[PDB]
Amino acid sequence: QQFGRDIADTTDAVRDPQTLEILDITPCSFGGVSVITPGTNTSNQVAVLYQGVNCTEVPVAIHADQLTPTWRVYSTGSNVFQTRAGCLIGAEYVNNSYECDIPIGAGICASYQTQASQSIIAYTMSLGAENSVAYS
């Protein structure tokens, strides 16, 4: 058996012609990039969500050739938070909960809030104000 194909008839494994050593072919690391912006009127600050990857494994490219976005400055930055949607770089996670402003996913939202330089923060969205009805 010289090689193997996946469902889409794409080669996913191959036998080396010289060494006859079996090799799996996995496509190079790829993913979606989402830019959370408060609005260019409000600010030029942004946050970057790398979707469906742990940011142990976010682009750590040190040369422009190694990875397609040539903007490395928003990778492995000071503000790094892991979500189930992806890992978000450039927004500080706060334990406070607010009404959703910019949806990120898995219950995490982002907002541009003052805290006193105003910056992008990430938080768990607030479902509402808790109440207890005085049942008797």
Binding site: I7, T26, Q51, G52, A85, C100, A106, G107
Partner: peptide
Amino acid sequence: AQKFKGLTVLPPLL
């Protein structure tokens, strides 16, 4: 296999 062909699933917001 679907992901390797460009097809991915986004988590629901809630």
